[PDB]
Design an enzyme around this catalytic site. Structure first.
Site, PDB file in Angstrom:
ATOM      1  N   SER A  28     -18.054 -27.618  66.231  1.00 13.98           N
ATOM      2  CA  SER A  28     -16.838 -26.950  66.689  1.00 13.98           C
ATOM      3  C   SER A  28     -15.707 -26.989  65.671  1.00 13.98           C
ATOM      4  CB  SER A  28     -16.348 -27.583  67.996  1.00 13.98           C
ATOM      5  OG  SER A  28     -17.411 -27.808  68.900  1.00 13.98           O
TER       6      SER A  28
HETATM    7  C1  LIG Z   1     -18.108 -27.094  69.842  1.00 16.89           C
HETATM    8  O1  LIG Z   1     -17.297 -26.246  70.032  1.00 16.89           O
HETATM    9  C2  LIG Z   1     -18.877 -27.767  71.039  1.00 16.89           C
HETATM   10  C3  LIG Z   1     -20.132 -26.907  71.432  1.00 16.89           C
HETATM   11  C4  LIG Z   1     -20.642 -26.128  70.236  1.00 16.89           C
HETATM   12  O2  LIG Z   1     -21.163 -27.722  71.881  1.00 16.89           O
HETATM   13  C5  LIG Z   1     -17.973 -27.946  72.124  1.00 16.89           C
HETATM   14  C6  LIG Z   1     -18.478 -29.096  73.067  1.00 16.89           C
HETATM   15  C7  LIG Z   1     -17.652 -30.160  72.765  1.00 16.89           C
HETATM   16  S1  LIG Z   1     -17.662 -31.674  73.769  1.00 16.89           S
HETATM   17  C8  LIG Z   1     -18.458 -31.348  75.371  1.00 16.89           C
HETATM   18  C9  LIG Z   1     -19.294 -32.560  75.784  1.00 16.89           C
HETATM   19  N1  LIG Z   1     -18.509 -33.776  75.643  1.00 16.89           N
HETATM   20  C10 LIG Z   1     -17.538 -34.132  76.663  1.00 16.89           C
HETATM   21  N2  LIG Z   1     -16.859 -35.178  76.551  1.00 16.89           N
HETATM   22  C11 LIG Z   1     -16.380 -29.676  72.112  1.00 16.89           C
HETATM   23  C12 LIG Z   1     -15.401 -30.689  71.498  1.00 16.89           C
HETATM   24  O3  LIG Z   1     -14.170 -30.628  71.768  1.00 16.89           O
HETATM   25  O4  LIG Z   1     -15.815 -31.602  70.733  1.00 16.89           O
HETATM   26  N3  LIG Z   1     -16.576 -28.460  71.590  1.00 16.89           N
END
Ligand SMILES: *C(=O)[C@H]([C@@H](C)O)[C@H]1CC(SCCNC=N)=C(C(=O)O)N1
Length: 445
Positions: A195
């Site tokens: 991300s």
């Molecule tokens: C990046 O944008 C990721 C995606 C590609 O998988 C998303 C998911 C995550 S975190 C979700 C799961 N964890 C919860 N605590 C984010 C992030 O902010 O790191 N972006």
């Protein structure tokens, strides 16, 4: 017999130096083994034991810099039969900078080896290694405006002093039987950026003109696809918010916003902007890396892959060092700064990878990750220091890697790229990185 050159850090502190020790031997082997000329260990003696003053290769920072510095060993039969001038009891670099700089460091046995001064800050290197605590991961700290590699850390690690001077078969097999593989140099291994890569996709959108930083996109739900042709693949976000502009999408990690902006601009506009980075380039660093890639083919051939690549997933492979180099455009008004490891090497740049307006627009909105109470890096908020940051994860198809990118916006003197592998088990990079960010805000400022 010439003395091996020294690898020193940016202040002259020792990284690979020489030190005299008082070491061995010349039922009795078991009697020697049950109490502590061939040296064995460092120092009323068993039958066959003795002591002598032997000079040994020493690494002060130990495992904190093992993969970068490497270790040395005796010149093998296969080593001498590959070049020239080799002693039977000589010392040759087997890995790391001890190998890459071996020609300069060994001299001729008679001029002594030359001393090589690096950009590494020992204080930063040790702090950046200490936050991991056996967790698999890496950390790359740099001077964004000059390219100086202030630290290059891989975790877990190994004792370089034992590998060079004397390690048992049980300790070596323990190093080899580790599923986390401490011998690998994770800072040089290509991963998907995650991300955090949305920063670059955002900049590319700003410059292409298709992305308006104030446009309020209507986004509803936790998952979105272009239409039925996407099948079961959706772009997903963690929190529900609408309408979403550029700043709020970067703070809330909204993949739906960036998937739509990536499809809005199109594969050509997206690849036009990606190609201005260092994809495919072999770098001048003395660290072996596979060049970064965008995808396996020259074309995505898939709207799923085009959108997936928009938020750091898909077939992106970028090493932490290459990620640090790409992200340097935000602290240099759009100019990319290549990394340097030798302190006296001239600074190399690539002009106008993104525009100055796009770099500063992203860099300013990233302050919200640290300064807003709802931001994901608010734990490291400091009212007396301007820090931009961007967290992120990458899913490997059922594991995740955690990424943290921080930028010094008070003086543009440091940049951090931290990664924690298997973040579902080992936690995020944001959870362990605060002592490093606090250390850097006080030292490098
Ligand atoms: C990046 O944008 C990721 C995606 C590609 O998988 C998303 C998911 C995550 S975190 C979700 C799961 N964890 C919860 N605590 C984010 C992030 O902010 O790191 N972006």
């Amino acid at each position: 017999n010439a003395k091996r050159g020294e690898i020193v850090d940016r202040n002259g502190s020792g990284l690979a130096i020489n030190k005299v020790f008082d070491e061995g031997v010349v039922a009795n082997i078991k009697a020697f083994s049950d109490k502590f000329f061939v040296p064995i260990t460092v120092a009323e003696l068993p039958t066959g034991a003795a002591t002598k003053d032997t000079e040994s290769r020493y690494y002060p920072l130990g495992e904190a810099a093992a993969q970068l510095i490497g270790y040395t060993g005796t010149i093998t039969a296969e080593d001498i039969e590959k070049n020239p001038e080799l002693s039977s009891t000589g010392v040759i670099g087997k890995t790391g900078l001890e190998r890459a700089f071996d020609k300069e460091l060994r001299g001729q046995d008679k001029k002594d080896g030359q001393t090589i001064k690096l950009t590494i800050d020992s204080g930063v290197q040790q702090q950046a290694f200490a936050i991991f605590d056996k967790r698999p991961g890496s950390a790359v700290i740099t001077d964004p405006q000059k390219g100086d590699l202030l630290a290059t850390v891989s975790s877990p690690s190994y004792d370089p002093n034992k590998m060079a001077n004397g390690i048992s078969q049980k300790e070596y097999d323990a190093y080899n039987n580790n599923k986390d593989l401490p011998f690998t140099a994770r800072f040089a291994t290509g991963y998907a950026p995650g991300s955090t890569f949305k920063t670059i996709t955002g900049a590319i959108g700003l410059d292409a003109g298709t992305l308006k930083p104030d446009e309020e996109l209507e986004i509803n739900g936790l998952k979105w696809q272009k239409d039925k042709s996407w099948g079961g693949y959706f772009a997903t976000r963690v929190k529900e918010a609408s309408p979403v502009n550029l700043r709020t999408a970067l703070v809330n990690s909204d993949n739906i916003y960036f998937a739509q902006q990536t499809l809005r601009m199109g594969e050509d506009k997206f690849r036009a902007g990606l190609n201005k980075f260092i994809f495919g380039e072999e770098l001048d660093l003395p660290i072996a890396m596979t060049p970064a890639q965008i995808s396996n083919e020259d074309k995505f051939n898939s709207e799923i892959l085009l959108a997936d690549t928009g938020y750091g997933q898909g077939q992106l492979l970028i090493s932490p060092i290459q990620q640090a180099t790409m992200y340097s455009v935000f602290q240099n008004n759009g100019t990319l700064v290549y990394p340097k490891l030798v302190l006296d090497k001239e600074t190399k740049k690539k002009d106008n990878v993104i525009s100055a307006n796009a770099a500063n627009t992203i860099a300013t909105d990233l302050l919200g990750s640290v300064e807003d109470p709802s931001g994901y890096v608010y734990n490291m908020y400091n009212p007396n220091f301007s820090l931009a940051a961007k967290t992120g994860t990458a899913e490997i198809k059922g594991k995740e890697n955690s990424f943290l990118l921080t930028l010094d916006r008070s003086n543009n003197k440091f940049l951090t790229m931290i990664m924690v592998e298997n973040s579902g088990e080992n936690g995020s990079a944001t959870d362990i990185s605060k002592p490093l960010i606090d250390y850097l805000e006080a030292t490098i400022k």
